[PDB]
Design a protein around this ligand. Structure first.
Ligand SMILES: [Mg+2]
Ligand SMILES: [Mg+2]
Ligand SMILES: [Mg+2]
Ligand SMILES: [Mg+2]
Ligand SMILES: [Mg+2]
Ligand SMILES: [Mg+2]
Ligand SMILES: [Mg+2]
Ligand SMILES: [Mg+2]
Ligand SMILES: [Mg+2]
Ligand SMILES: [Mg+2]
Ligand SMILES: [Mg+2]
Ligand SMILES: [Mg+2]
Ligand SMILES: [Mg+2]
Ligand SMILES: [Mg+2]
Ligand SMILES: [Mg+2]
Ligand SMILES: [Mg+2]
Ligand SMILES: [Mg+2]
Ligand SMILES: [Mg+2]
Ligand SMILES: [Mg+2]
Ligand SMILES: [Mg+2]
Ligand SMILES: [Mg+2]
Ligand SMILES: [Mg+2]
Ligand SMILES: [Mg+2]
Ligand SMILES: [Mg+2]
Ligand SMILES: [Mg+2]
Ligand SMILES: [Mg+2]
Ligand SMILES: [Mg+2]
Ligand SMILES: [Mg+2]
Ligand SMILES: [Mg+2]
Ligand SMILES: [Mg+2]
Ligand SMILES: [Mg+2]
Ligand SMILES: [Mg+2]
Ligand SMILES: [Mg+2]
Ligand SMILES: [Mg+2]
Ligand SMILES: [Mg+2]
Ligand SMILES: [Mg+2]
Ligand SMILES: [Mg+2]
Ligand SMILES: [Mg+2]
Ligand SMILES: [Mg+2]
Ligand SMILES: [Mg+2]
Ligand SMILES: [Mg+2]
Ligand SMILES: [Mg+2]
Ligand SMILES: [Mg+2]
Ligand SMILES: [Mg+2]
Ligand SMILES: [Mg+2]
Ligand SMILES: [Mg+2]
Ligand SMILES: [Mg+2]
Ligand SMILES: [Mg+2]
Ligand SMILES: [Mg+2]
Ligand SMILES: [Mg+2]
Ligand SMILES: [Mg+2]
Ligand SMILES: [Mg+2]
Ligand SMILES: [Mg+2]
Ligand SMILES: [Mg+2]
Ligand SMILES: [Mg+2]
Ligand SMILES: [Mg+2]
Ligand SMILES: [Mg+2]
Ligand SMILES: [Mg+2]
Ligand SMILES: [Mg+2]
Ligand SMILES: [Mg+2]
Ligand SMILES: [Mg+2]
Ligand SMILES: [Mg+2]
Ligand SMILES: [Mg+2]
Ligand SMILES: [Mg+2]
Ligand SMILES: [Mg+2]
Ligand SMILES: [Mg+2]
Ligand SMILES: [Mg+2]
Ligand SMILES: [Mg+2]
Ligand SMILES: [Mg+2]
Ligand SMILES: [Mg+2]
Ligand SMILES: [Mg+2]
Ligand SMILES: [Mg+2]
Ligand SMILES: [Mg+2]
Ligand SMILES: [Mg+2]
Ligand SMILES: [Mg+2]
Ligand SMILES: [Mg+2]
Ligand SMILES: [Mg+2]
Ligand SMILES: [Mg+2]
Ligand SMILES: [Mg+2]
Ligand SMILES: [Mg+2]
Ligand SMILES: [Mg+2]
Ligand SMILES: [Mg+2]
Ligand SMILES: [Mg+2]
Ligand SMILES: [Mg+2]
Ligand SMILES: [Mg+2]
Ligand SMILES: [Mg+2]
Ligand SMILES: [Mg+2]
Ligand SMILES: [Mg+2]
Ligand SMILES: [Mg+2]
Ligand SMILES: [Mg+2]
Ligand SMILES: [Mg+2]
Ligand SMILES: [Mg+2]
Ligand SMILES: [Mg+2]
Ligand SMILES: [Mg+2]
Ligand SMILES: [Mg+2]
Ligand SMILES: [Mg+2]
Ligand SMILES: [Mg+2]
Ligand SMILES: [Mg+2]
Ligand SMILES: [Mg+2]
Ligand SMILES: [Mg+2]
Ligand SMILES: [Mg+2]
Ligand SMILES: [Mg+2]
Ligand SMILES: [Mg+2]
Ligand SMILES: [Mg+2]
Ligand SMILES: [Mg+2]
Ligand SMILES: [Mg+2]
Ligand SMILES: [Mg+2]
Ligand SMILES: [Mg+2]
Ligand SMILES: [Mg+2]
Ligand SMILES: [Mg+2]
Ligand SMILES: [Mg+2]
Ligand SMILES: [Mg+2]
Ligand SMILES: [Mg+2]
Ligand SMILES: [Mg+2]
Ligand SMILES: [Mg+2]
Ligand SMILES: [Mg+2]
Ligand SMILES: [Mg+2]
Ligand SMILES: [Mg+2]
Ligand SMILES: [Mg+2]
Ligand SMILES: [Mg+2]
Ligand SMILES: [Mg+2]
Ligand SMILES: [Mg+2]
Ligand SMILES: [Mg+2]
Ligand SMILES: [Mg+2]
Ligand SMILES: [Mg+2]
Ligand SMILES: [Mg+2]
Ligand SMILES: [Mg+2]
Ligand SMILES: [Mg+2]
Ligand SMILES: [Mg+2]
Ligand SMILES: [Mg+2]
Ligand SMILES: [Mg+2]
Ligand SMILES: [Mg+2]
Ligand SMILES: [Mg+2]
Ligand SMILES: [Mg+2]
Ligand SMILES: [Mg+2]
Ligand SMILES: [Mg+2]
Ligand SMILES: [Mg+2]
Ligand SMILES: [Mg+2]
Ligand SMILES: [Mg+2]
Ligand SMILES: [Mg+2]
Ligand SMILES: [Mg+2]
Ligand SMILES: [Mg+2]
Ligand SMILES: [Mg+2]
Ligand SMILES: [Mg+2]
Ligand SMILES: [Mg+2]
Ligand SMILES: [Mg+2]
Ligand SMILES: [Mg+2]
Ligand SMILES: [Mg+2]
Ligand SMILES: [Mg+2]
Ligand SMILES: [Mg+2]
Ligand SMILES: [Mg+2]
Ligand SMILES: [Mg+2]
Ligand SMILES: [Mg+2]
Ligand SMILES: [Mg+2]
Ligand SMILES: [Mg+2]
Ligand SMILES: [Mg+2]
Ligand SMILES: [Mg+2]
Ligand SMILES: [Mg+2]
Ligand SMILES: [Mg+2]
Ligand SMILES: [Mg+2]
Ligand SMILES: [Mg+2]
Ligand SMILES: [Mg+2]
Ligand SMILES: [Mg+2]
Ligand SMILES: [Mg+2]
Ligand SMILES: [Mg+2]
Ligand SMILES: [Mg+2]
Ligand SMILES: [Mg+2]
Ligand SMILES: [Mg+2]
Ligand SMILES: [Mg+2]
Ligand SMILES: [Mg+2]
Ligand SMILES: [Mg+2]
Ligand SMILES: [Mg+2]
Ligand SMILES: [Mg+2]
Ligand SMILES: [Mg+2]
Ligand SMILES: [Mg+2]
Ligand SMILES: [Mg+2]
Ligand SMILES: [Mg+2]
Ligand SMILES: [Mg+2]
Ligand SMILES: [Mg+2]
Ligand SMILES: [Mg+2]
Ligand SMILES: [Mg+2]
Ligand SMILES: [Mg+2]
Ligand SMILES: [Mg+2]
Ligand SMILES: [Mg+2]
Ligand SMILES: [Mg+2]
Ligand SMILES: [Mg+2]
Ligand SMILES: [Mg+2]
Ligand SMILES: [Mg+2]
Ligand SMILES: [Mg+2]
Ligand SMILES: [Mg+2]
Ligand SMILES: [Mg+2]
Ligand SMILES: [Mg+2]
Ligand SMILES: [Mg+2]
Ligand SMILES: [Mg+2]
Ligand SMILES: [Mg+2]
Ligand SMILES: [Mg+2]
Ligand SMILES: [Mg+2]
Ligand SMILES: [Mg+2]
Ligand SMILES: [Mg+2]
Ligand SMILES: [Mg+2]
Ligand SMILES: [Mg+2]
Ligand SMILES: [Mg+2]
Ligand SMILES: [Mg+2]
Ligand SMILES: [Mg+2]
Ligand SMILES: [Mg+2]
Ligand SMILES: [Mg+2]
Ligand SMILES: [Mg+2]
Ligand SMILES: [Mg+2]
Ligand SMILES: [Mg+2]
Ligand SMILES: [Mg+2]
Ligand SMILES: [Mg+2]
Ligand SMILES: [Mg+2]
Ligand SMILES: [Mg+2]
Ligand SMILES: [Mg+2]
Ligand SMILES: [Mg+2]
Ligand SMILES: [Mg+2]
Ligand SMILES: [Mg+2]
Ligand SMILES: [Mg+2]
Ligand SMILES: [Mg+2]
Ligand SMILES: [Mg+2]
Ligand SMILES: [Mg+2]
Ligand SMILES: [Mg+2]
Ligand SMILES: [Mg+2]
Ligand SMILES: [Mg+2]
Ligand SMILES: [Mg+2]
Ligand SMILES: [Mg+2]
Ligand SMILES: [Mg+2]
Ligand SMILES: [Mg+2]
Ligand SMILES: [Mg+2]
Ligand SMILES: [Mg+2]
Ligand SMILES: [Mg+2]
Ligand SMILES: [Mg+2]
Ligand SMILES: [Mg+2]
Ligand SMILES: [Mg+2]
Ligand SMILES: [Mg+2]
Ligand SMILES: [Mg+2]
Ligand SMILES: [Mg+2]
Ligand SMILES: [Mg+2]
Ligand SMILES: [Mg+2]
Ligand SMILES: [Mg+2]
Ligand SMILES: [Mg+2]
Ligand SMILES: [Mg+2]
Ligand SMILES: [Mg+2]
Ligand SMILES: [Mg+2]
Ligand SMILES: [Mg+2]
Ligand SMILES: [Mg+2]
Ligand SMILES: [Mg+2]
Ligand SMILES: [Mg+2]
Ligand SMILES: [Mg+2]
Ligand SMILES: [Mg+2]
Ligand SMILES: [Mg+2]
Ligand SMILES: [Mg+2]
Ligand SMILES: [Mg+2]
Ligand SMILES: [Mg+2]
Ligand SMILES: [Mg+2]
Ligand SMILES: [Mg+2]
Ligand SMILES: [Mg+2]
Ligand SMILES: [Mg+2]
Ligand SMILES: [Mg+2]
Ligand SMILES: [Mg+2]
Ligand SMILES: [Mg+2]
Ligand SMILES: [Mg+2]
Ligand SMILES: [Mg+2]
Ligand SMILES: [Mg+2]
Ligand SMILES: [Mg+2]
Lengths: 275, 48
RNA sequence: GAGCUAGCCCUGGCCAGGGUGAAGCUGGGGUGAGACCCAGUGGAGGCCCGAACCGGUGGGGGAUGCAAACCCCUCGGAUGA
RNA sequence: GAAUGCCGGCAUGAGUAACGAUAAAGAGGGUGAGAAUCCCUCUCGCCGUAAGCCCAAGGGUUCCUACGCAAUGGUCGUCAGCGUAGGGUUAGGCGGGACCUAAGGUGAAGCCGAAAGGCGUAGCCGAAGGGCAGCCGGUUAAUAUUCCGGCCCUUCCCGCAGGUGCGAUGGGGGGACGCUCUAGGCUAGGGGGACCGGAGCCAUGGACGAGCCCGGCCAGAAGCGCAGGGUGGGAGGUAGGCAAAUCCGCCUCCCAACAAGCUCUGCGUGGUGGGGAAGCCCGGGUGACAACCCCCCGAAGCCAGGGAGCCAAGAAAAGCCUCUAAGCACAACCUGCGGGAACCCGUACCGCAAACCGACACAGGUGGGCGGGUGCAAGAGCACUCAGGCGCGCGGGAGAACCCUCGCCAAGGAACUCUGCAAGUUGGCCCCGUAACUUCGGGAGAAGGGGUGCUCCCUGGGGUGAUGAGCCCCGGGGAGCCGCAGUGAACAGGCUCUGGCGACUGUUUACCAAAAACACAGCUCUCUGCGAACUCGUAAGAGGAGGUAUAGGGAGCGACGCUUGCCCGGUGCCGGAAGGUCAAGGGGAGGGGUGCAAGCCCCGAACCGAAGCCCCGGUGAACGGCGGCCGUAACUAUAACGGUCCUAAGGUAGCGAAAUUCCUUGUCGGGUAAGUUCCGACCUGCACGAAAAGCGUAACGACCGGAGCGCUGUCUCGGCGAGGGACCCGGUGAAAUUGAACUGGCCGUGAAGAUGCGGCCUACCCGUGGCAGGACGAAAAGACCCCGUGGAGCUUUACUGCAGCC
RNA sequence: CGAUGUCGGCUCGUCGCAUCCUGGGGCUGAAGAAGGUCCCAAGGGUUGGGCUGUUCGCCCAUUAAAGCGGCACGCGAGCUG
RNA sequence: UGGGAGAGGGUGGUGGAAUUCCCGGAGUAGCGGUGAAAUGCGCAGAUACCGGGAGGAACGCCGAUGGCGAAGGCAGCCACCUGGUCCACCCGUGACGCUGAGGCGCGAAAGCGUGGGGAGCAAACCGGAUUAGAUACCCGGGUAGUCCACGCCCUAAACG
RNA sequence: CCGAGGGUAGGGCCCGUGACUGGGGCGAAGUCGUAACAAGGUAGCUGUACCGGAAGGUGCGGCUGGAU
């Protein structure tokens, strides 16, 4: 559930906050944090290349194990579930019987005290990771690699998951979070279960200040600007779009498809997203 | 009110100083010109 | 040329005093268990009043100025974007 | 001789404005050629969360002393931040460097670019962050944590003694962290003392007093005491920490666990060294063998890496410790002690300002620390005042108009005016009390009202003590006294009813607009499967993101409530393996030039041949659009109904003379004596209408309307008073402007508005304070307007290109 | 057009007279009182308020009357805005 | 105490038929629909047939005039948790009872909020017919919704 | 001291009245269509939802107080 507030300020009337119930530990493992170099949306030339970024709360980056096949057969105990400011999902601290310690992102239903393990021979249980070819058709899965040994890329945000839909040759067929149907190589690793913190999307920010804490600076409409600034600029008084709705750079932004047509991964994408 | 000159010696030397000028094509031409004209000071003098 | 100004980045600093009294917690009541109600405790908030500090609402003065934007009175924010 | 020409010089305005905060001066003595202005003394005033003190920047000798006064100083000058000269800045411990890293910058390897150059993990550089050893007093004209004195301390080298598997740029621990709130115990700082020390005083009616006045501390190793921070111990196993590891991590077993222990810091004490007032006397002496004690208040500072709660989840690296590798184990390291060694730069002075930024000794701007006392509920607010610092570098008179800032006003009380603009009123605290409506928080300090000083008596609880006295905090009850008045001075909301717009706190046109504009949570459309889309770049490379569709980009709408209709013909976008059109290229029927020829060369039809366009369809919270005429009902009027032309389809709900209504001050109702505004209605909506959203909405607003109560010099209608100017005298002394001028009125004339022409009238010569009708007064080669085959910003289904993409 | 500042208000007037009032007259469909209409007459006078930026106008309460014009639609080196 | 029947309820899992869509094959001139038609779909290859896949909803036969529940209502199969009820024994308690204003709880469908899901169906809506007209009945489309969770709504020819 | 009451201010309840507006009843000599009663010409009624000049329609679920 999400936590609500009594309307004792105009903003607490709508503000909702996560309950943080799953979190058992409030400090990150010191050996697994490193400083995150805040960018402000600026590239190496010093230029804004993503608008309206910066000024958010300071964060340390928790190193996440998106490989997992690094330690096949070596089981680990779920020591803690922690807050991670760098992702919507929560993280889980693993204590391997190796003595090694790592973070994975927390599946839904994971239990502090539980054992997890990775490998072809892993049981089909929440928190375990296996190559896709050894996971039964129909089971929902997360932290999915897109190519072998390149790292988990798919189904990583809070509440997300992919479902195994069948097998074809060296490839399994997944329904991705987006509804897309895609072939992924069978040697790609995945973690059974869905990502936790599914309530994430029911959060109501509540005020402008909260967006600013996240590093989101105010977004100013193209219609509020001048012709030098934006296609939608100008007009005396307010103005409708007066042309097909465009980005600051002139390209149309109501329907225009933008995926590159000759892209090689088209050979592996069966059905474009839904909705 | 607060005016435009807010002197700062590190800023002066790091911006207009001799090593700054030497680092860059335009900066070296500045020096060449200033020497060709006979300037007594090639670069702003800063206490340091 | 970003020693003015705009934004961001790193690292420091500052915000008298007073007011309001959220959740939680404990007790009591309540019930099959609850919801919930009350009291105490508690100390939340782009909360309130108001200096510093940041402003620049209205009026008056100034107008070869004290000043190429100032002065007086009044007024906005003052734990927060 | 003219170019609002250029350079220079010198005039006019003119002895005029001004002399830079209205904090304020007076006298006496001295010095000197000269004194309102310099020095000295007494009196007066101003600052005191500063207008005092300390630090950082910036400035760069402005510091100290002597001798000067041409210029500088808004007057003066004997003085000075000015002229000349001499002197003055002392560090192992303060700051920076011989230490570390942050953003960033640079950059071996490596990548990219016509050149110049652009990137780039490591490394390096980079601080006001981390790290690191000095406190108190004294001394100079001028420096002092630097010199001196006392008491402490750090590192390097070397040697001795003891101890240990020693050893690192490698592994590990640690360093290492937010915001808000906050415990205990301390210190800084403060207040009181009938106690301790002290020169003296007894006035002018009283007091020789438990009188007045002054002061009553500072630093300090070891040790000890108090308060806190930090940390479990042993064994066994071990596959992880990119070699090794006995370290760290993980697993198990046993003692210990909110203890102690070990360790570290703070505070107290502490050998010792210091300081030491008023007053008086000429910075110094004396006071003085100074005393140096008790109680209370008490930090935001310290113990500290303390505690709790919360979500937005809060640097790095070295120093340090530990582990081991080569090695080396007569070494090496650790601990104690001792001797030696210990470099470079800064240090003066100003520092909220006359020494910095503003051309000025400029009412402006400038980061950190200290910032006493009393009273007002608190406080850094306000009044006064300590320490300390100042009276603002022109004065002296006068007592007009007028101006500024300020005080008061009979009767009236918004009649002022675009508007109560302005100014009154209200005003802190305690108590009583408080409406619609509401999202149940609020609205709310609603409104409105009562109390407020002093004296005496009684009494309740708390803090420190000890449980008591003392002190200090929070109270309660009774009886009285005084004044016009008790937050007696200063600081401190006027209130309400009702519309519009925007939900709200915020943001903005630096220097004419703060708003209804922007932003905002939230809603929807849409793109994006990750080497994402998108953005910057020629590229490499970056951002996006060390993120992964509960995510990221673009667009509109803008809390919330109830909702968001019809039109897909045009444009856009999406889908469509048919077909049409389609470039290079392929193909080569046929034709041509030339040659004696083989041959060389040229043109070229059918056919094959992509995107795009055409074509088929979908799509509105995509661009956008959302009718007209005639007829018809028991009176009239109107038309539920019917007919008909057109269209892609003819505006739904809701709202409506509106931030939209031309006619318009529509009509009607309300408010007013009177209402072009306002509120409520109606609907012939010139020309509302549903995310350029429609209609509502509690709360909010230095937004813009309308009304009322309170109160007022806003006004009837003006009067008086205050100070700073204006005026006069002494000192200093501008300005724009200026064809030259010996520069009146009228009625005329004149390029059509005459001091200057005609006629007439008026008029002795020259100034001072005043007022603004004229000199088509000054200022700025009109912004409007037009013209120029003048410019620039912007737009697009103008033209033609280019990037980008296909 | 190398600049002749603009509506309205406030303030300050001054003039014209085609006279709103007061004075003097003739005609009357002038009984009186009250009017109508023309003539002479510019000496003085010619109110306060609601609406609206307004001039104007409408309205309220009065009045002897609530005049119309000119003066760069008088007057911004006089004010307002 | 010992037994019984049952779509009584809640949670989780799971099975087959059918519709739709998508992919592959095969194949051609229509399919569909009605009282009859037209809109629509179809040579851009539909319908009819075969194979593969995805997905939601409802459970044929058994099934009945049946069963269960206080009512609303409950129907594939399995497991778990759980209510009511009947019978036989006549063992225990000793009138512990009946009803019940207020209260509390449950309460079909539609509807509402937040989020999922979306095959079929289907208000609104669009088109075709019918008809004097046809904002209907019939036909081709079609969005909420119908389904899941949680929170509301509290109505009925909630009837015997 | 209490005190009739008067005054300031703020609440509650009732009645009368109001531009305009909502539907209701009656009138009937009108206009429109014909929803219900027969299988009433789409069986009806129904709670609710959306919609249409109007009766009413349709969806979802329910009742028979439904003809054959
Ligand atoms: Mg949860
Ligand atoms: Mg809330
Ligand atoms: Mg709360
Ligand atoms: Mg709540
Ligand atoms: Mg509120
Ligand atoms: Mg609110
Ligand atoms: Mg929470
Ligand atoms: Mg959680
Ligand atoms: Mg680290
Ligand atoms: Mg990072
Ligand atoms: Mg860079
Ligand atoms: Mg750069
Ligand atoms: Mg650059
Ligand atoms: Mg940005
Ligand atoms: Mg997290
Ligand atoms: Mg969350
Ligand atoms: Mg949200
Ligand atoms: Mg954040
Ligand atoms: Mg946003
Ligand atoms: Mg915006
Ligand atoms: Mg604009
Ligand atoms: Mg630009
Ligand atoms: Mg452009
Ligand atoms: Mg443009
Ligand atoms: Mg536009
Ligand atoms: Mg426009
Ligand atoms: Mg515009
Ligand atoms: Mg605009
Ligand atoms: Mg417009
Ligand atoms: Mg606009
Ligand atoms: Mg706008
Ligand atoms: Mg538009
Ligand atoms: Mg437009
Ligand atoms: Mg347009
Ligand atoms: Mg593009
Ligand atoms: Mg791939
Ligand atoms: Mg300058
Ligand atoms: Mg500065
Ligand atoms: Mg300077
Ligand atoms: Mg500097
Ligand atoms: Mg510096
Ligand atoms: Mg600098
Ligand atoms: Mg340099
Ligand atoms: Mg020079
Ligand atoms: Mg020289
Ligand atoms: Mg130079
Ligand atoms: Mg910082
Ligand atoms: Mg503050
Ligand atoms: Mg309380
Ligand atoms: Mg709690
Ligand atoms: Mg606040
Ligand atoms: Mg406040
Ligand atoms: Mg600022
Ligand atoms: Mg102002
Ligand atoms: Mg004012
Ligand atoms: Mg004033
Ligand atoms: Mg002025
Ligand atoms: Mg000022
Ligand atoms: Mg002021
Ligand atoms: Mg104020
Ligand atoms: Mg305030
Ligand atoms: Mg405050
Ligand atoms: Mg606050
Ligand atoms: Mg704030
Ligand atoms: Mg902040
Ligand atoms: Mg000439
Ligand atoms: Mg000239
Ligand atoms: Mg000139
Ligand atoms: Mg000249
Ligand atoms: Mg010249
Ligand atoms: Mg002359
Ligand atoms: Mg004179
Ligand atoms: Mg003069
Ligand atoms: Mg003198
Ligand atoms: Mg003199
Ligand atoms: Mg003196
Ligand atoms: Mg004073
Ligand atoms: Mg003080
Ligand atoms: Mg200087
Ligand atoms: Mg000195
Ligand atoms: Mg001189
Ligand atoms: Mg002189
Ligand atoms: Mg002289
Ligand atoms: Mg001078
Ligand atoms: Mg001067
Ligand atoms: Mg002399
Ligand atoms: Mg001087
Ligand atoms: Mg000397
Ligand atoms: Mg020393
Ligand atoms: Mg050295
Ligand atoms: Mg360095
Ligand atoms: Mg440093
Ligand atoms: Mg140091
Ligand atoms: Mg010391
Ligand atoms: Mg010295
Ligand atoms: Mg950290
Ligand atoms: Mg730090
Ligand atoms: Mg904060
Ligand atoms: Mg001390
Ligand atoms: Mg005190
Ligand atoms: Mg005596
Ligand atoms: Mg202690
Ligand atoms: Mg090991
Ligand atoms: Mg002494
Ligand atoms: Mg002595
Ligand atoms: Mg003695
Ligand atoms: Mg504090
Ligand atoms: Mg969070
Ligand atoms: Mg942390
Ligand atoms: Mg680093
Ligand atoms: Mg060896
Ligand atoms: Mg050792
Ligand atoms: Mg050296
Ligand atoms: Mg030196
Ligand atoms: Mg010094
Ligand atoms: Mg000075
Ligand atoms: Mg200042
Ligand atoms: Mg001065
Ligand atoms: Mg100054
Ligand atoms: Mg002090
Ligand atoms: Mg006070
Ligand atoms: Mg006070
Ligand atoms: Mg104050
Ligand atoms: Mg004092
Ligand atoms: Mg003075
Ligand atoms: Mg002066
Ligand atoms: Mg005089
Ligand atoms: Mg003053
Ligand atoms: Mg008066
Ligand atoms: Mg009044
Ligand atoms: Mg009155
Ligand atoms: Mg007003
Ligand atoms: Mg006051
Ligand atoms: Mg009320
Ligand atoms: Mg309430
Ligand atoms: Mg009050
Ligand atoms: Mg109110
Ligand atoms: Mg008294
Ligand atoms: Mg008084
Ligand atoms: Mg004052
Ligand atoms: Mg106030
Ligand atoms: Mg007022
Ligand atoms: Mg009100
Ligand atoms: Mg509005
Ligand atoms: Mg606003
Ligand atoms: Mg706004
Ligand atoms: Mg709103
Ligand atoms: Mg809003
Ligand atoms: Mg707002
Ligand atoms: Mg604020
Ligand atoms: Mg401007
Ligand atoms: Mg401005
Ligand atoms: Mg400007
Ligand atoms: Mg400007
Ligand atoms: Mg202004
Ligand atoms: Mg503005
Ligand atoms: Mg404002
Ligand atoms: Mg704006
Ligand atoms: Mg906005
Ligand atoms: Mg919304
Ligand atoms: Mg972008
Ligand atoms: Mg580009
Ligand atoms: Mg890159
Ligand atoms: Mg990044
Ligand atoms: Mg990246
Ligand atoms: Mg990155
Ligand atoms: Mg991402
Ligand atoms: Mg906006
Ligand atoms: Mg409402
Ligand atoms: Mg319609
Ligand atoms: Mg269309
Ligand atoms: Mg279209
Ligand atoms: Mg169509
Ligand atoms: Mg178009
Ligand atoms: Mg074909
Ligand atoms: Mg041929
Ligand atoms: Mg829509
Ligand atoms: Mg159109
Ligand atoms: Mg549109
Ligand atoms: Mg219309
Ligand atoms: Mg209307
Ligand atoms: Mg309106
Ligand atoms: Mg508007
Ligand atoms: Mg309109
Ligand atoms: Mg018009
Ligand atoms: Mg109108
Ligand atoms: Mg009009
Ligand atoms: Mg009217
Ligand atoms: Mg008005
Ligand atoms: Mg108005
Ligand atoms: Mg009308
Ligand atoms: Mg727009
Ligand atoms: Mg609009
Ligand atoms: Mg506001
Ligand atoms: Mg405002
Ligand atoms: Mg006056
Ligand atoms: Mg007076
Ligand atoms: Mg006076
Ligand atoms: Mg005076
Ligand atoms: Mg005076
Ligand atoms: Mg005289
Ligand atoms: Mg002459
Ligand atoms: Mg003339
Ligand atoms: Mg003339
Ligand atoms: Mg003349
Ligand atoms: Mg002449
Ligand atoms: Mg002449
Ligand atoms: Mg002549
Ligand atoms: Mg003449
Ligand atoms: Mg004359
Ligand atoms: Mg004049
Ligand atoms: Mg003139
Ligand atoms: Mg003249
Ligand atoms: Mg003039
Ligand atoms: Mg003139
Ligand atoms: Mg020119
Ligand atoms: Mg011109
Ligand atoms: Mg011009
Ligand atoms: Mg010009
Ligand atoms: Mg202009
Ligand atoms: Mg023109
Ligand atoms: Mg032309
Ligand atoms: Mg021409
Ligand atoms: Mg151009
Ligand atoms: Mg002109
Ligand atoms: Mg001129
Ligand atoms: Mg001119
Ligand atoms: Mg008669
Ligand atoms: Mg006559
Ligand atoms: Mg006559
Ligand atoms: Mg007259
Ligand atoms: Mg006259
Ligand atoms: Mg008027
Ligand atoms: Mg008018
Ligand atoms: Mg009228
Ligand atoms: Mg009369
Ligand atoms: Mg006139
Ligand atoms: Mg005219
Ligand atoms: Mg005119
Ligand atoms: Mg005029
Ligand atoms: Mg006039
Ligand atoms: Mg005028
Ligand atoms: Mg003016
Ligand atoms: Mg005017
Ligand atoms: Mg003038
Ligand atoms: Mg004038
Ligand atoms: Mg005005
Ligand atoms: Mg104006
Ligand atoms: Mg059956
Ligand atoms: Mg039955
Ligand atoms: Mg028995
Ligand atoms: Mg129900
Ligand atoms: Mg339902
Ligand atoms: Mg429903
Ligand atoms: Mg019809
Ligand atoms: Mg709907
Ligand atoms: Mg819905
Ligand atoms: Mg039944
Ligand atoms: Mg009475
Ligand atoms: Mg019928
Ligand atoms: Mg029928
Ligand atoms: Mg309707
Ligand atoms: Mg109709
Ligand atoms: Mg229908
Ligand atoms: Mg039933």
């Amino acid at each position: 559930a999400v936590k609500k507030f009594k309307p004792y300020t105009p903003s607490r009337r709508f503000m909702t906050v996560a309950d943080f119930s799953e979190i058992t530990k409030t400090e990150p493992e010191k050996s697994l944090v490193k400083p995150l170099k805040k960018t402000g949306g600026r590239n190496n030339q010093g230029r804004i290349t993503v608008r309206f970024r910066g000024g958010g709360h300071k964060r340390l980056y928790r190193i996440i194990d998106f490989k997992r096949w690094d330690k096949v057969g070596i089981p680990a105990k779920v020591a803690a579930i922690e807050y991670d400011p760098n992702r919507s999902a929560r993280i889980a601290l693993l204590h391997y019987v190796d003595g090694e310690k790592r973070y994975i992102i927390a599946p839904d239903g994971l239990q502090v005290g539980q054992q997890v393990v990775a490998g072809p021979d892993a049981p089909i249980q929440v928190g375990n990771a296996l190559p896709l070819r050894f996971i039964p058709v129909g089971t929902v899965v997360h932290a999915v690699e897109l190519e072998p040994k390149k790292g988990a890329k798919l189904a990583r945000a809070a509440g997300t998951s992919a479902q195994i839909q069948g097998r074809e040759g060296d490839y399994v067929i997944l329904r991705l979070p987006s509804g897309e149907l895609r072939k992924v190589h069978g040697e790609c690793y995945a973690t059974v279960g869905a990502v936790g913190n599914a309530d994430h999307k029911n959060i109501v920010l509540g005020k402008a200040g909260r967006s600013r804490w996240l590093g989101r600076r105010p977004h100013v409409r193209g219609a509020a600007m001048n012709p030098v600034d934006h296609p939608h600029g100008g007009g005396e008084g307010r103005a409708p779009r007066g042309r097909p709705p465009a980005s600051p750079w002139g390209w149309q932004t109501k329907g225009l498809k933008t995926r590159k047509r000759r892209k090689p991964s088209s050979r592996f994408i069966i059905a474009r997203r839904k909705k | 009110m607060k005016r435009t000159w807010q002197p700062n010696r590190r800023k002066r030397a790091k911006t207009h100083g001799f090593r700054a000028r030497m680092r860059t094509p335009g900066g070296r031409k500045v020096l060449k010109r200033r020497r060709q004209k006979g300037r007594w000071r090639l670069t702003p003098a800063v206490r340091k």
